[model samples]
Target: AESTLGAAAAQSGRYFGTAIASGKLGDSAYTTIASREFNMVTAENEMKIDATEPQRGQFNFSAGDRVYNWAVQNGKQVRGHALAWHSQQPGWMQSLSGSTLRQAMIDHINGVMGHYKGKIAQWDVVSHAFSDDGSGGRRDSNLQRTGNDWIEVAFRTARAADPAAKLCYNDYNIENWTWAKTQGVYNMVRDFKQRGVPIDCVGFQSHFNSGSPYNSNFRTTLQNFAALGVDVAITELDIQGASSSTYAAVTNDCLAVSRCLGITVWGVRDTDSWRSGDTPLLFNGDGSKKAAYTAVLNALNGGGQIKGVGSGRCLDVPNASTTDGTQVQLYDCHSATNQQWTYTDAGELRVYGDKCLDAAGTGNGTKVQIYSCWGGDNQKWRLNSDGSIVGVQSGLCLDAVGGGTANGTLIQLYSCSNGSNQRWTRT
Candidate 1:
């Protein structure tokens, strides 16, 4: 009855996408749903190194190219699954040592990225770099043995090969309860930024169990990295819950954080999901929409401005500056255009044209400001049913700095309490 999920996402400057295997592309049921529901497609295995280059120095892209061509013909954006990963490397290449292995990785990255140049929108340049050691550290795998610098080299080679494609580092369990793994990945990306690496985004593989509690820190983790000035995305998201809570949780998390580029379900249908037993997708086995699907649609379509419940002051960006990092403050409710905010399906509060309300950092006293929106987590906020406006990443309420009521009193994110200063009314 409504436009497809992809169309709805596009309306808000984001994408709704799914992963696909080559074999499934020919299935009518699969293709029909995929072409209609998704704006983007990622090759689940065809684009991986193992599938592309099964033999040393021999590259085969028949399957990958087929998928890519289909996407192009269907007016869909294609994401290259990965160029470098510790797992699934051909035995011949993995047998090499020292400089040979390092050179092989560089060659593979260049070969894959160059082949798909100007065609793909993004590449998982490096995937699964963290080790689940419970201590949060880099994997002690072959890539590391080739000298710990192979990760950097891979990104550099990909950049040279495909300058326009967005390069991302992807990993799983970072959004799970493994705190060490999360911190490890965070530190690694931060280090890459400090070294001026060519990495453009960080992807969290949000594979969740339907029975587990949602990670409360999920949004915070996203914002922590966004603070480094790179984009963030929920690259692979699939929750195993039978009800819609899981869907709503992820939808809200993405909406609360602006930097969240998009959410990609691991597959299109519950029958095809990697966690099929858990039924972890938006579509049922028969291609019907599930409760989760409606949850996402509702959140994506929801939006409005927030007014202080007590003072009737609207949250306004100071001086209506479109500059980056402009402080957001309270002002008299004149129904001024600057006070008007639209919460997009992408999970950003936009005002003053395109500037967003941003939490300056991932701390208690982080200043809430208005910055040119780049989909950073600092720009995401949640208008809770309890009337408290919480920063999606900070999990803290938007507080009138020092509880001041005077105009120009800057806003800040603080631990949420039942204080009237933390309450708001969305109009």
Candidate 2:
């Protein structure tokens, strides 16, 4: 019904992407979908240290280069999956210690990133460094135990090897877990930022379950990291559901946060997904679009500034207040930051930094004000195709108070009368 997800996301300054195992490129179904649907590709395994350098002082980029060349021919950007990770390293390299181990790691990064050079857009310089003990601490992995400086060394080496590529620190379990894993990654990235370690983005690998305990604070987490001035990306995303809610959460979080660069589904199809039994990817086994695919596409296309149909004015948060209770009004569309609004999949119209456009008290004629988003019905809204925004609980339309056209006219809830004042446009 809509353009490719990648094409649609491009309109909003983001990329829609996926990961691929090089062997799967031979299958027509897989290649067709990958080439048509996504704008970016990550080498699922070939780009990793183990795959590239199986022997000491020996390099084999044959597999990774194939994928990179394919991406180039198809007009898609390639993301280097990783340069260094604790799990996937040659046995010889893993057994080395002291300065020898550290130099080997740096040499690997230099060899890999230097080989690809300007051809790749970004590199996952360090991944999964946080410990799983739920203590908000670094792992006792080789790099961490060897010293904290190793992680920094990897990033610095990659930057020197390929200065143009965007460098990222990526990890999983951060999306839904705020207690230890998520907080630990946040602290690590913040420390890197403070020290001028060359990190351009933080990648949240949002692996989710169809069941409950979804991270409610995902947007807040993205915002917190974005505040550190590094772009945040959904490096690998897959929730175990054909459900829209899961897909919507990822889409809306990126839309709500400005520094969220893009989302890359963990795999191209269910059959190829790492979590194969759970069927977490967007495409079905037969190369068909799944419910999650449509859900993400819709959510990506859902947000923008809301404007009055009759008044021709944009919805604005007075004076751009970051407080919890700011009045939302209609003002001439100057495209000011305050006038920007995003309809989150959480069903809230959010603006001015995590505040929701709430219907005060949830009654008829209740003025809409910006309040801290609490997932209450008063804060939820449904954007109708007829250019009306209906309150999910009260069943009222977002109306301009008294149908006034001037700037400073307050917005409120009113019975859905199909009136001009109740109509709006999302640019």
Candidate 3:
């Protein structure tokens, strides 16, 4: 039961994050879930330019400190929300023009990035600077008008301020690689890489709707960005209707790409999201898990091969058999579907998203087989931190036959033991 969302995501070598609203930090209702399930947290508004520097040259780190401090106390990594954005700007900074706008942008980036220099894991150096018309254009903002290289200047300043933190260009509607806006962003990242710019990642604000699930070539988009030598992340996600499938789709897309860094759900509950009216979040207002939460948890845990610590092999579906009652075995690790196992809950280890790894009978020597997932206790498995997999019903360890260390060694439900053959790892 302790295989939490953050734990599972960490197992896959990725962070699962959420945005923390400073106002909600005192509420136990929100704090409990926010601190427990997410490994990374984004300050919702505290780190923004306007919030950090409200009046000319006057700085405030109190609210942002509260949020970042919560992350530190919870052992969570903090991602700086937005160093600069046109929407949230102080009047003093917003009304500036010409060289002043250029100076302000650099100063603002330095101010925020330098303050959270070492604490932040990454920084959204610039946000939504690309145009929405899909014409490969930049937004007509004061900063954009200040110079054609404002974005470049921002990224360079961030790198100088915090060399270790990843610098990212964040924007929405760029998850689909085919979108001209996405291509434009892609072009910028590519050019940056070629020109030795200090950019490290691209962030997609993956806001989805119920009308269509996130079936875009998101994996391809992330892969393409990764090919450019920049990591990718789902910076802000909130799906309308809290659809589980939609959430799973987004998670799986991230999991399929190695350079896909992590995901940050926009808010904790449906009631607090900017799209709250659309009921777009992973939890209810009462801090209870929603179906979307289950989907995301499952997605984070699935899509990888399970390797045996002793045998140096993977748990394989014999010959990729689709038949029920087919006994499972240990085989050489391969990038095949049969070797892929999904730990979708503590309940079952699924293969092909259908068959369950089942203990035939509640006996020490009973055989383990791939049976149709029927939600029985026999199908339940507990992944131990000690690298052992135990049957919840049978209370036996999944073992290589006779503790054999050879290929084609049959895996069975055997008396729980400290044998190396019984140890397994999800890769």
Candidate 4:
């Protein structure tokens, strides 16, 4: 009954949703416009409803009701703003004993989900509950937070409350494959799936500034999650403001992201966007579409086929070894045995007799150095039919030799692929 158009178009089969600012809904008239265009809507602000911290632990559903009611009336899907988030939860939830906290969480989920069971399609269930950026889960504030593991309790409770609705673990910045953040979510998704956790989808909130590239192997990374039977979705999509050249770059990145599921720009126009003062929307404040709007539309509709192995040039080596830490620099094609890299039966990209591509030292700052080809994770590379080379161990792209022909330039892991950088032509 609720809409799934934008996500259906952009994300392919991925779920799409955005937060509805209270002010926008309060205006009343725009509700229809929003409902007609978007299939999914999230709670913008009202995260802390009714009750505050310490004294009362009950949830006030009044604000959430307004949005849910609007969704019901318009036949649009509503994703519960959140049940257990560090930002929105009251301070009292922190000090309570584990048992008391768990019980309170269950009660809150039941109260909310029971009220709008069939109306809402999915619930954030848990949000911003992880600390992949650093040690400890809590961000600085008056309240102390628990470990990222709290997501399990919150998700379990939501499942019990509404068996029919989908539950998601939502977080921002997992769009690229190589970062610890992305791997963290990957492991989380796998762990939940293995344990029969009710994680139906992993929401990738694509909030970016211009020029931040998407890893070429991003789709492969996402495929791993989908492989576990959990679907993927790009939730909040927006590119921070920049010059025309940079704007085009962002759109290119967005297009690559869309290949996974499609993306949803948080707001249709800049005027209505939360970052209006800072980063204007796809359309200018005066309603004229910006370059990003046109670029993204073209990318989604263009139907451009990935051209054949863009560049399959291999280098000649005089003294490369099969030992780890052996650096393989890209040299001019010499047609020598040392320059040949074989795509093995086990799906590994190797050179010099089974020596696979290895991450130099396995350090975060390590370049994708070549090493003696071993069958370990480091040597395993998935050469997708699309011609993207992703390292099996690190989730990085096989960066272009010399980062694009600056001669003697080095290849390394960048955020992800944009057409030219990611495209590889294999002969």
Candidate 5:
């Protein structure tokens, strides 16, 4: 067997993690794979408001403890699923409002974090507080209707309860660059950082299905948030189809950003996935690895080289420098680190771990550069069956300027003629 998922991820200074239901702890096979492959664990629903505080002030740690104890035994860092959320809240919450409701939130936060305190490494202190539309409306909830800034209140409470643990604001649909929902969350996190709120990280619930598409702009999205001085993580990820390349894309994107803490797959197995029929987990029902396991492993080991179809040269980042906007060029096919390129499922050609091969513009003669991945139309390219790599934005081929076979020849976007210079073969 190859290196475990956690081992592969650790090589790139990242953690490989998965969510587990406390009830599934009894499933020997499920626990076996989880303990072996992942370095981090998230209690899928155990730490939620309903599960932890079933009735007002009364508490229950039986379920949360089962998952936490198992993770401790396996040397896994536990992530507190959430401290405040609208869904799965206890029914008792419906009766409380105004200062009482806000106090109840504070008390609930104290109850949960007070018990787990130093144990749960990081927490989703607030999640799903806003609407998905561009209006930036608040999602109606007991906490929101309280006429209070519940998110700030939760973060402040958690900070006092567990001073060592990182407090995160978590949400979904924030991975895309173009979405207004994404912009809203960014503004909130940025505001928190500017205002000196007690926030440390952001969690992206990267859930996808047939209707919900995966945003390749995720790389840029992470970098953007990280720039705001908060750590970012793929707190929950499960794309439909579980394609190997998609898994690699996420892995490579995380590896590229220093502030990206790590990735946590939503579940241990496809059968246990919330989106079950999609089969989105890295393991199958019986606890065997999927192609996704290999994709992530290979991405961690550094992806293969992209060589020219006829020139026999590899795409190289000159001087091995990772400076922003460095032009990619044609070089001798020696398979150097700078030559390694991964063609992601999102149609992004990634190099140097974090940079995407970008078409500077859509027009012909637009030279390519290794830009920080923003998942824009210019960063997307389609690999044709005929060996041609064409830019999705410009509808042009990847042309080695003047069809030169020499080293340091500029790579540019040109009208497709299917010439040798326009084709590439990924190793």
Candidate 6:
């Protein structure tokens, strides 16, 4: 339940809405989503102050404060936009050198982070520190221009300031692992963790475009970081809708990453998505849901079914030969290859070659058990006319329940089936 998507979806919650200042925020699309959720993010202009150093270090909190106040009054949790970022540098900020800049960074982190300390659940403490290509060797307008190690100072200072807010290093293009520049990000995260840097999370800005493959391997990257004890979040997620498949790819990746801490698709509907203009979201400019939206819900809720398998007779294969499970199991069914099932519609169950989709038959405490046709209704299934198939007797979907990756991971019938493991799509 602590899994990211599981937590959000379980509560009928999916992180909803963009910052108040974003042009898309007030759109009827976002308002509808916000009304249904309890978490709202503050806008960027609100987070950054316009004043500079010794001359003046004043913060113009009116913008961010308004959004924060709105969130608080509406009983929604706030996600702090940023304490330090290179993009929104004020005019006076360009003149400060060395210590002044460093102190300014510190003061800003402390002043802003401290002010919102208990109110924000999370903060994007240091944002876009790395380039889109992941190159770190080259310094940016902020890092090289300011002559201060902003990344290092931002994290350390913010932690000291709020302590309560979850601090994250947010960036884009994290999904592009093939680029050598991407290593820059890996090294920063690794070095931070190694040096005992106070990083709480790494935010992957999943600003996906149509036709791009979802970063399926991102979890291995996250696991590598999480192994260092840092949490991972898909802080800004949106897919430039190409097709239902593209949405499926993003959702599948999200589900995988959710095993760590689920994903947050920046806006719920296509019309509200930041990239909708360029790539469009799970909808066109209209409020209608796209195939990607339905696909996401399908993937998130589980997909496919196990029509009967084999010849309606029960059979088993050995544990050592299979890749997905220890054995290749199927059932005796109505003789349709559809019945010689892989995964069916609704995506929750799998059947091989049709033999009453079963798990290993001999064990009791028999869970962690795969389903098998024991000639009982517990194994009997009916692929409902409406596409929701259920076991006539057990009231459970034929499930690949535990998400076992290795051979011999027994298949079992389970009541819980809301993820990819629980659902399958016919290839």
Task: For candidate 4, give the lDDT of residue 409.
Answer: 39
Candidate lDDT (C-alpha), each? 0.80, 0.83, 0.84, 0.56, 0.84, 0.55
Error of 1 at 360 (Å): 54
- Cα lDDT tens digits, model 5, 1-427, are 2267777778767788999898888889998899899999999999899999999889999999998999989978999988887888888987787889899989999999999989877899988887875766667888898874788878988999999999999998888877888888898888888998899999999987667677689899999999999999999999787866778888888999998888999999988998888878887676655556657866777658878877898889999878877888989878577898887765577887788998888788897998899857578666655678767657678899999989989898999998999888877
Q: How many steric overlaps does candidate 3 have?
A: 0
Q: Name the 10 consecutive residues with the lowest summed lDDT in model 5.
A: 286-295
Q: Can you give the TM-score per candidate against the true fold? A: 0.69, 0.70, 0.71, 0.58, 0.71, 0.63
lDDT of 4 by residue, 1-427 (tens): 2122343344444333456665677644455456655666776665432231223545566666776677667655676656666565555655554556656666666777777677666667766555565432333322123344567877887888888877877777666676767777777778899998888877666666544444445556666677778766556666665233333443344344433443445765566777776443454444333434433433344320111133334432336455566555455555566666666534455665656656664433456666665545565554443556656456566665434543333556544464455556565
In candidate 5, position 350 carries an lDDT of: 84
Q: How many residue pairs clash in each candidate at the backbone level?
A: 5, 0, 0, 24, 0, 37
- Candidate numbers sorted by TM-score from highest down: 5, 3, 2, 1, 6, 4
Q: Candidate 6, residues 171-251: lDDT per residue as tens digits?
A: 776666665445677788788888988988887777766444456666566666676677776666666543455556655
Off by over 4 Å in 5: 304-427
lDDT of 5: 0.84
Question: What digit string (tens of lDDT, one per residue) describes model 2 on residues 257-359?
Answer: 9998888999998899989887777776776565456568777777367889999999998888877766788998986778888776456778865888888
* lDDT of model number 4: 0.56
Task: Give the clashing pairs for model 1.
Answer: 255-347, 256-380, 258-375, 259-375, 259-376
Residue ranges of candidate 3 with Cα displaced over 4 Å: 210-213, 303-427
Model 2 root-mean-square deviation: 12.7
